[PDB]
Ligand binder design. Structure first.
Ligand SMILES: [Mg+2]
Lengths: 69, 631, 48, 52, 1196, 4
DNA sequence: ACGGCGAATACCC
DNA sequence: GGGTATTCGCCGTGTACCTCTCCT
RNA sequence: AGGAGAGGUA
């Protein structure tokens, strides 16, 4: 609860349950891309908060783009 | 066979099952009756065999239904197949709604008052077990061990490169903490762990009334969510920062409680003729700098200049300006108020009720994190200014009124006259009951009244100033603060304990005319043990009554879920005020808040105010009371 | 993986007799106080 | 409660259990039909539609 | 007030006004005076027959079947135990003595019943009958090397009890309760028809039983209403045997009526002493209730009139001429102690013995039949051993400190065989009755489901000869209180008016008042003083022994005294003991009336002293003809039942003059013969920074370094050498493939060295057993050819230390193979042990007669055959007896567990300091967990620089009305000041005429007790004054304690304000607090709830077998139970993914656990949750009934 | 919290 | 031990 | 024949945790 | 490995 607020994301998503579903899809796609093991052990963040933050900034993803069918 | 197992024992034995006993007791009658049938043995014994084969199977399926107690070696009835699926210790309960789990631990909880509301203190020794495969992977990742055996090895020697990997692994990885009876859903909350040293768990002081915990011995369990869908579910739904209000009411659960309430109550009181009275400050930095110098009191009335924005009910934002009349202590709290809230919230004495109101407004007008920041800051300020106050309790705080002895002597003379009546047979049940008990019940409260006119008032007469001022007594300020203590509890320390109860409920005619300060005698301390034992006996022979009711309620209503936005219905119930037949006892407002309308709410003249289908909120229930509507 | 036990005499299932009501004393319409005599060898019934 | 009085009747009537419930879904270990267990069904109904 | 040896090294100032009338009786005399009646005879207390012999005497003549054989009990004697109480727990034996009885036979010429046993074969002898465990000198039992206590029992006293059960009207019952037998009870109904019943049979009419005389015409003669008339015209039976067969139809379902089996039953359900008894109390209570004494005082069976009278009184009570009984009165409940219970089990086993003798008295056919091959003794030993090993009232002893033991030996349970259940009972057997006053403590009980059902004993209370508790009072004859103590029972004092100890008397022992609060029917009252009959002897007469250790108890709340008493039975004893500065005058009694302090038996003077023994030189002119020398041996670092440490330390110096009773050593948590469970701390009542927020406690770290709450903890591990089938288990050090570095701390045998520091995970003993048939998988076959691994015909069952633990080995004990020639190692160790131990017995014996001869050559040098020519031949037998037994074992001092060869024990001891997480408490009901140890320059401090020890929140005090906690801190400030008034004088002119003058103002200025220091010499004033430098100790009794005028006077003399309040300074800035704080000297304890043995995390361990879930309990590797209420909460959040894995992949999805672990360690994501393996278990045992539960696909 |  | 519920059977409308 | 009026059996009675010995 | 009895904590 340092610098990612759940109130910041409840302006984009619904129900506080949709937030969990969408954030988990985003996080799973981040983690199934590498994101570690090579050079950034203590130089990055957790995919959970990285995915939860891109929703609170209208960043790399919005709810409609989060699919990647 | 692997479900009725034959595990060995210590020293050449077998702790066999009861399902093998009851299987053998059936095979050994089946075979017997078979080779008895082969020989054409008489019917008068073949029937006796057949009746024995049947009872053996009835016991294999469940003993106790018809037979008596078909019993094993240790004079204890054998456990059948219809006992491994039924009752509190069967399969359904104890194994399928149950499930002991891995990645789990326990410890004792301590207080740790320098935490933020979203944090807990987790020992290194526990956190190293709970997070052990994560550590194996992060070792074998960042080039410390090649195969998992050397990593497993350096984890048990507790190297130096391990205690920082553990700090990076548990960084933004939450954990849930639970207490002994989980009575509602606030008994589990997720936190963010920070490695401490020691063997207890540190628990933020404000999440304690949720858990119902204090720090005289309680313990707690720690579970680790393992998957990203459970790690996100921990942050988004359970994390302690989201659980600000009760789900049974709307009231807040992070309201400061005991000695945060006393500090905030202390500094915001005011003393009339104080040192530095009437000064003129222009900021919070001003009052701070002038206070830190020892030249001005904390209860001195001052004048302060404010200039701040204040949101109101409709949502508009006016501007609060001017020069207000304050106290030094209130103006020292002006630093923690956020923008949106008016200084009229702090500009009062700050009993428990008013602090909860501050937190209510902060949540309704400003939202979630504003409230969890304001609460932390109120926590720190109360903790600090109750200390700097040096507030204690002695034995002279319990001030015993000066009329007590005369009050009691007059009650005694009245009792003597009542029995004087009774000795001439002028009354039978009253002249030894319901009259003496009313004398004593009236004197009890006259003396409890005299005792608050002595612990509440004070006296100064300095500049011809001889008058009564509100006291700063430490026992009084603890009750009037709403921090801890009642009027009856205070009535027994320094008034008189009055009438006691034999367990059946009747009143013991002879009242304890002494309080805990002068000390009870032995014939007075005896008669107060009946009530004490009765209470303690009720307390434990009652949680079963309530736990049963709760379990029934959760089984009747369990599968009810909100599954759609509207059903289109137009029927409902007629709500009113729930009067007693004498007075209101609850308004229609506070009963219709949050409930949506099924019919229009046309007024007595003819025009309507609210259409059907409007979610009533606080900005629409004043129209119900301002326009005289009552159903 | 289970096995079985080839009984040589039939035996009633206690549940279908003493679960109150009895799904056996109700099929025949005879009180369980009378089914329990025939089942534990203390009286006769005329099958035909 | 009353597990035998319930199981005998259920077996005579040859009852069928559509799982369908909160408690029925924890005994067999799958997502309860509430909360995030509903929303994953809902938010996944949107994908097969978008792939069509 | 010096007046003793240790009672004058540090004198305690006493407060209070009430006199001394009766001193607290010996505390344990409920356990020791009841196993004395069982085994010994006393003609002074009129016990001419021990109760071991009243059981034999009443059952023995067997007379098998007209065979010229009749056995007669003659006499008995109890043997001598093999070992002593000290050696049994060492080896693992039970401290018991054999019983041998004298039995004589008789015979004659087997004639036509012409005295077939009168003539010949008059043989007689002593025969072994069984083993009886003996009670040690304190009141415990060593049963397989384990101290135990046999709790007392409160049960329902025999007699006739007329209940009512008020639901309808006219319903009246009447039960006759036996000591042992059948429950004959009657009843009524609003219809008016008397019924009957036997043990639990169905209700059959009352005139049925009346047929013992029948005679329907001779009933109404001795029986005047329509009640039996509604029964006499309800009795269809006319003849006797018809009614008997009717009643027989109730005593046997499915039976046919006989003619000699039916009459035997009725004539032998209430009339055969071998199957029914009222037992001396039923008879007298019956004769009292029914009033008459038509029956004798020794007829323990139901005479015929004891049923006619019961029927008559039932109808009279129904008609209003009488009163019903009170089931919870302590007149209707009697106490049954350990002697009575073991006597019952003795009677049980002896009946089987005497029923087997006469049986095999015939089937034995030989010549010269001695009475030794006909009686067996196994069914006596085996019943007594069953009572002691598996009984429910025979419990592990509570040690943890002296008070735990003293308070466990004084406990009176209502549960147990013959009593209630923790569930059936409710709400009125759990209630403080009016007859508990003086008899049971109405404050001390458990706080769980046992509340009201455990009920320890009061202070002056006495179980009398019938089993009814009693309490002492002072007769008030002719209006003047006299000094004749008298013990009254609950039935007795029902008709007396009883004042209290603290009523006001005036110089002539008259009452000064005219209306006082008395107890007139057990009930309180405000009556004239002319009506009083008795008066209590003390003011702690009402409270227990552990509640009388709490100062200022009349200023506390019973709900909190209840838990203040219960928590000082959990206090760990400390490294160095320390008195309470505020006490009650009862720590001496509790430490003395337990057996932890050493007490001198004779007047003497110390001859030698060290920390192993004390040798007194008996002054024989004032003492008995004693041995001329007393030798006391000392306990040193002994393990306790709670793994704590018991240790004795001597007090005396070589040359000291001691008396009879004086304390010569201190023991388990004692300090100059006073009980010391914790330390005195300087407490400040103020909030500090949220570090005492709820009930937390803040400590000084001047306390951890001062080693205040440090304690020693001894743990005992065992390793056994079995005789397994596939190969014997040997304890040789040749551990296969063990690292050679770990082979250092072990001796040439394979056991550790005494004194090594072992860590978690080291070998303590090395035992090896065989193992063959390896057959490793192909993985090891593809990589084992690179090192050419060797084959192991042996395994390693070698004991290791557990996890987390450490310490140093302080003792190792070995017991080798029973009845087997040991090799050049084990037999050598045993021979050296014998040579060393007999040598120590020699030096112990070479000094006893050394002092004896030093005394013999004392009164003769300055006929010598009187007292010199006897001592030397006496001690030789002592070294003789001790010398063989010290090696006279069974090669393991026991059977060594057949199938096991050697058993070795290892003791490890560790020191434990207080830390954040540990639980602390004071004697006033206030507990709390330590949150922080602050540095010392951060604590508040006094004006002169003295820091503070603890800070305790003041909010908790007025809500929980325990004010004695505040008065204690005031009286502790007072005493701290009084004791610095002495340290000031000691550093300036340390004479003994000055010290004798400051002590006079410290002691004899406040109060009327007057220590009287004019009886100490100047060498004693100098040690008294040097012990009063921490504080002058003060004693305040429990309802007669110090006032507030007195605490104010003492605070003045100490130089403080007449409130406990003073200015403190912020240790972090140095400026004062406003508002003076209350500082004082509260006495604080440390309870056995340390956080070290409570932490327990687990990631993945090992699982069950049937359900395949994790194990549970921190002893295997635990795993916490995510219960069902904890699942309702995850459901109320909507956490579906959290709830699906806490049910499948975390506990018992067998295929999912391995994949989750392999995923985490590799950093991947995948999750299939197939189905929890405990649902397959349930559907597999629902089809083990006849039912088919199955999965399906629903196409329709 | 409620029984009487 | 207590309570509440339900099938069983005997005693009057 | 119908309708109560006892009578008797069955099912239920809070959560988590620690220790000991004893049996198998 | 499992169960009984007994105690205790919240
Ligand atoms: Mg607590």
């Amino acid at each position: 609860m340092a610098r990612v607020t759940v109130e910041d994301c409840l302006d984009k998503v619904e129900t506080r349950f949709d937030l969990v579903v969408l954030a988990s899809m985003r996080a799973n796609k981040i983690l199934k891309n590498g994101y570690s093991e090579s050079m950034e052990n203590e130089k990055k963040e957790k995919a959970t908060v990285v995915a939860l933050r891109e929703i609170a900034e209208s960043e790399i993803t919005s709810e409609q783009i989060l699919r990647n069918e | 066979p692997d479900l009725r197992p034959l595990v060995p024992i210590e020293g050449g034995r077998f702790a066999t099952s009861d399902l093998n006993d009851l299987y053998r007791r059936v095979i050994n009658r089946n075979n017997r009756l078979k080779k008895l049938l082969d020989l054409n043995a008489p019917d008068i014994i073949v029937r006796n065999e057949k009746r024995m084969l049947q009872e053996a199977v009835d016991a294999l399926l469940d003993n106790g239904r018809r037979g008596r107690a078909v019993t094993g070696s240790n004079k204890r009835p054998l456990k059948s197949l219809a006992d491994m699926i039924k009752g509190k210790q069967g399969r359904f309960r104890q194994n399928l709604l149950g499930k002991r789990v891995d990645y789990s631990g326990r410890s004792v909880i301590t207080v740790g008052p320098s935490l933020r509301l979203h944090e807990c203190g987790l020992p290194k020794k526990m956190a190293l077990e709970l997070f052990k495969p994560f550590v194996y992977s992060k070792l074998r990742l960042g080039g410390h061990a090649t195969t998992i055996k050397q990593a497993k090895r350096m984890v048990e020697l507790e190297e130096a490169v391990v205690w920082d990997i553990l700090e990076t692994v548990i960084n933004e990885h939450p954990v849930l903490l639970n207490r002994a009876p989980t009575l509602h859903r606030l008994g589990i909350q997720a936190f963010e762990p920070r490695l401490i040293e020691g063997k207890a768990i540190q628990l933020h002081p404000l999440v304690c009334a949720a858990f119902n915990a204090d720090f005289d011995g309680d313990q707690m369990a720690v579970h680790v969510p393992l998957t990203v869908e459970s790690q996100l579910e921990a942050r988004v739904l359970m994390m302690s920062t989201n659980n600000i209000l009760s789900p049974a009411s709307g009231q807040p659960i992070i309201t400061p409680t005991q000695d945060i309430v006393l500090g905030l109550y202390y500094i915001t009181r005011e003393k009339e003729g104080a040192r530095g009275e009437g000064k003129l400050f222009s900021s919070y930095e001003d009052v701070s700098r002038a206070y830190n110098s020892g030249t001005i009191d904390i209860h001195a009335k001052i004048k302060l200049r404010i200039d701040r924005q204040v949101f109101d009910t409709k949502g508009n934002t006016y501007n609060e300006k001017g020069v207000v009349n304050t106290t030094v202590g209130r103006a020292l709290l002006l630093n923690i108020l956020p923008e949106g809230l008016s200084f009229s919230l702090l500009n009062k004495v700050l009993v428990k009720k008013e602090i909860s109101k501050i937190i209510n407004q902060a949540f309704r007008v400003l939202g979630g994190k504003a409230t969890v920041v304001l609460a932390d800051k109120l926590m720190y300020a109360g903790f600090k200014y109750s200390t700097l106050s040096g507030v204690s309790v002695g034995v002279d705080d319990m001030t015993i009124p000066d009329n007590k002895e005369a009050k009691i002597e007059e009650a005694e003379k009245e009792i003597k006259q009542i029995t004087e009546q009774y000795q001439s047979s002028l009354i039978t049940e009253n002249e030894r009951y319901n009259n003496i008990i009313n004398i004593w019940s009236k004197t009890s409260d006259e003396v409890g009244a005299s005792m608050m006119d002595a612990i509440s008032k004070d006296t100064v007469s300095i500049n011809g100033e001889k008058k009564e001022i509100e006291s700063f007594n430490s026992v009084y300020m603890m009750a009037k603060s709403g921090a801890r203590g009642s009027y009856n509890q205070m009535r027994q320390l320094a008034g008189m304990r009055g009438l006691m109860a034999k367990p059946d409920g009747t009143m013991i005619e002879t009242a304890i005319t002494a309080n805990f300060r002068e000390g009870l005698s032995v014939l007075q301390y005896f008669t107060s043990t009946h009530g004490a034992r009765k209470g303690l006996a009720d307390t434990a022979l009652k949680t079963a009554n309530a736990g049963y009711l709760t379990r029934r309620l959760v089984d009747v209503a369990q599968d009810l879920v909100v599954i759609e936005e509207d059903c289109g219905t137009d029927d409902g119930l007629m709500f009113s005020a729930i009067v007693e037949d004498g007075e209101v006892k609850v308004p229609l407002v506070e009963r219709a808040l949050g409930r949506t309308l099924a019919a229009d709410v046309v007024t007595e003249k003819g025009v309507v105010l609210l259409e059907a289908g409007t979610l009533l909120d606080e900005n629409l229930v004043e129209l119900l009371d301002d326009n005289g509507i009552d159903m | 993986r289970m096995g079985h036990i080839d009984l040589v005499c039939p035996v009633v299932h206690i549940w279908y007799l003493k679960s109150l009501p009895s799904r056996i004393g109700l099929f025949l319409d005879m009180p369980l106080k009378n089914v329990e005599k025939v089942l534990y060898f203390e009286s006769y019934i005329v099958t035909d | 409660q009353e597990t035998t009085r319930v199981l005998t009747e259920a077996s005579i009537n040859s009852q069928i259990d559509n799982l369908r419930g909160l408690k029925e879904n924890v005994l067999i270990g799958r997502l309860i039909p509430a909360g995030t267990g509903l929303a994953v069904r809902k938010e996944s109904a949107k994908i097969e539609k978008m792939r069509e | 007030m010096s007046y003793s040896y240790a009672e004058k090294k540090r004198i305690r100032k006493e407060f209070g006004v009430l006199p001394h009338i009766l001193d607290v009786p010996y505390l344990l005399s409920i356990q020791t005076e009841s196993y004395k009646k069982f085994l010994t005879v006393d003609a002074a207390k009129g016990r001419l027959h021990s109760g071991l012999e009243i059981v034999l005497k009443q059952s023995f003549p067997v007379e098998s079947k007209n065979g010229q054989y009749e056995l007669h009990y003659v006499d008995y004697q109890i043997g001598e135990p093999t070992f002593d109480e000290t050696e049994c727990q060492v080896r693992g034996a039970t401290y018991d003595a054999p019983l041998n009885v004298k039995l004589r036979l008789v015979v004659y010429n087997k004639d036509a019943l012409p005295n077939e046993k009168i003539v010949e074969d008059i043989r007689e002898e002593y025969v072994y009958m069984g083993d009886i465990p003996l009670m040690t000198t304190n009141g415990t039992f060593i049963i397989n090397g384990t101290e135990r206590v046999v709790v007392s029992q409160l049960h329902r006293s025999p007699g006739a009890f007329f209940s009512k059960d008020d639901s309808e009207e006219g319903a009246f019952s009447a039960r006759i309760i036996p000591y042992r037998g059948s429950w004959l009870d009657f009843e009524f109904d609003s219809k008016g028809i008397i019924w009957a019943r036997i043990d639990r049979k169905r209700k059959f009419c009352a005139t049925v039983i009346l047929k013992a005389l029948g005679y329907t015409q001779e009933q109404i003669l001795e029986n005047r209403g329509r009640y039996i008339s509604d029964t006499l015209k309800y009795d269809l039976t006319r003849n006797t045997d018809e009614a008997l067969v009717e009643i027989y139809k109730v005593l046997r379902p499915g039976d046919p009526p006989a003619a000699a089996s039916v009459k035997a039953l009725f004539e032998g359900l209430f009339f055969i002493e071998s199957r029914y008894s009222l037992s001396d109390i039923g008879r007298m209570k019956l004769n009292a209730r029914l009033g008459s004494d038509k029956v004798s005082k020794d007829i323990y069976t139901l005479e015929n009139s004891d049923i006619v009278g019961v029927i008559e009184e039932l109808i009279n009570i129904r008609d209003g001429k009488g009163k019903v009984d009170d089931i919870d009165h302590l007149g209707n409940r009697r106490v049954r102690s350990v002697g009575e219970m073991v006597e019952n089990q003795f009677r049980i086993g002896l009946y089987r013995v005497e029923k087997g003798i006469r049986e095999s008295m015939s089937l034995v056919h030989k010549d010269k039949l001695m009475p030794k091959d006909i009686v067996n003794s196994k069914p006596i030993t085996a019943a007594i051993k069953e009572f002691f090993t598996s009984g429910a009232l025979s419990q592990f002893m509570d040690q943890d400190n002296p008070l735990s033991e003293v308070t466990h030996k004084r406990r009176i349970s209502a549960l147990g065989p013959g009593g209630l259940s923790r569930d059936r009972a409710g709400f009125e057997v759990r209630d403080v009755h009016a007859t508990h006053y003086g008899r049971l403590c109405p404050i001390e009980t458990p706080e769980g489901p046992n509340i009201g059902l455990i009920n320890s004993l009061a202070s002056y209370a006495r179980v009398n000869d019938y089993g009814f508790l009693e309490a002492p009072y002072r007769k008030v004859v002719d209006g003047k209180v006299t000094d004749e103590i008298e013990y009254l029972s609950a039935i007795d004092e029902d008709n007396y008016v009883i004042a209290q100890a603290s009523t006001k008397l005036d110089e002539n022992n008259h009452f000064v008042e005219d209306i006082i609060q008395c107890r007139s029917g057990g009930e309180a009252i405000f009556t004239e003083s002319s009506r009083v009959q008795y008066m209590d002897v003390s003011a702690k007469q009402m409270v227990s022994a552990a509640a009388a250790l709490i100062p200022f108890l009349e200023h506390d709340d019973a709900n909190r005294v209840l838990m203040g008493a219960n928590m000082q039975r959990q206090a760990v004893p400390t490294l160095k003991s320390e008195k309470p500065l505020v006490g009650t005058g009862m720590e001496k009694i509790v430490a003395r009336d337990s057996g932890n302090c050493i007490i001198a038996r004779n007047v003497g003077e110390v001859a030698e002293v060290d920390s192993n023994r004390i040798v007194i030189k008996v002054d024989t002119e004032k003492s008995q003809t004693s041995n001329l020398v007393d030798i006391y041996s000392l306990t040193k670092f002994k393990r306790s039942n709670k793994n704590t440490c018991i240790n004795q330390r001597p007090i005396v110096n070589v040359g000291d003059k001691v008396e009879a009773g004086d304390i010569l050593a201190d023991g388990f948590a004692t300090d100059f013969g006073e009980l010391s469970l914790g330390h005195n701390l300087m407490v400040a009542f103020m909030p500090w920074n949220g570090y005492n927020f709820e009930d937390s406690i803040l400590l000084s770290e001047r306390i951890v370094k001062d080693d205040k709450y440090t304690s020693i903890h001894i743990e005992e591990f065992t390793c056994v050498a079995r005789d397994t089938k596939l190969g014997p288990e040997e304890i040789t050090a040749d551990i296969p493939n063990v690292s050679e570095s770990s082979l250092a701390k072990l001796d040439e045998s394979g056991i550790v060295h005494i004194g090594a520091n072992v860590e978690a995970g080291d070998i303590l003993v090395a035992k090896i057993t065989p193992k063959a048939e390896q057959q490793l998988t192909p993985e090891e076959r593809l990589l084992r050819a690179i090192f050419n691994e060797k084959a192991s015909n042996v395994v390693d069952s070698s004991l290791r230390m557990p996890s987390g633990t450490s310490g140093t080995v302080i003792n190792v004990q070995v017991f080798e193979n029973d009845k087997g020639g040991k090799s050049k190692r084990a037999l050598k160790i045993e021979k050296e042990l014998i040579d060393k131990a007999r040598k120590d017995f020699d030096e112990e014996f070479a000094v006893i007669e050394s002092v004896v001869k030093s005394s013999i050559e004392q009164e003769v040098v300055g006929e010598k055959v009187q007292n010199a020519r006897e001592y030397y031949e006496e001690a030789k037998i002592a070294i003789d007896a001790k010398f063989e037994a010290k090696k006279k074992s069974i090669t393991q001092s026991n059977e060594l567990s057949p199938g096991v060869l050697k058993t070795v024990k290892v003791f490890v001891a560790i020191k434990k300091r207080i830390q954040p997480g540990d639980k602390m408490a004071g004697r006033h009901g206030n507990k709390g967990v330590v949150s922080r140890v602050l540095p010392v320059e951060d604590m508040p401090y006094m004006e002169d620089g003295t820091p503070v020890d603890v800070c305790l929140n003041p909010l908790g005090i007025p809500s929980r009305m325990n004010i004695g906690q505040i008065l204690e801190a005031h009286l502790g400030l007072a005493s701290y000041g009084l004791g610095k008034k002495i340290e000031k004088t000691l550093e300036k002119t340390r004479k003994a005429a000055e010290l004798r003058k400051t002590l006079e103002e410290v002691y004899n200025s406040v109060g009327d007790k007057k220590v009287n220091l004019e009886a100490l010499n100047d060498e004693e004033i100098l040690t008294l004054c040097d012990n009063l430098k921490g504080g002058v100790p003060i004693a305040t009794p429990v309802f007669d304690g110090a006032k507030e005028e007195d605490i104010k006077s003492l605070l003045k003399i100490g130089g403080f304000a007449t409130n406990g309040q003073m200015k403190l300074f912020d240790g972090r800035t140095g400026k004062p607090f406003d508002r003076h704080v209350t500082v004082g000297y509260m006495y604080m304890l440390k309870l056995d709830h340390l956080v070290d043995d409570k932490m327990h995390a687990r990631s993945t361990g090992s699982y069950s077998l049937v359900t395949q879930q994790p194990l549970g309990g921190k002893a295997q590797f635990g795993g916490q139970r995510f219960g069902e209420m904890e699942v309702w909460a995850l459901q109320a959040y909507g956490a579906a993914y959290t709830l699906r894995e806490m049910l499948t992949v975390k506990s018992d999805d067998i295929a999912g656990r391995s994949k989750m672990y392999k995923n985490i360690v590799d950093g991947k994501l995948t999750m299939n949750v197939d189905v929890p393996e405990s649902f397959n278990v349930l559907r597999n045992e629902v089809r083990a009934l006849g039912i088919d539960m199955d999965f399906d696909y629903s196409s329709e | 919290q409620l029984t009487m």
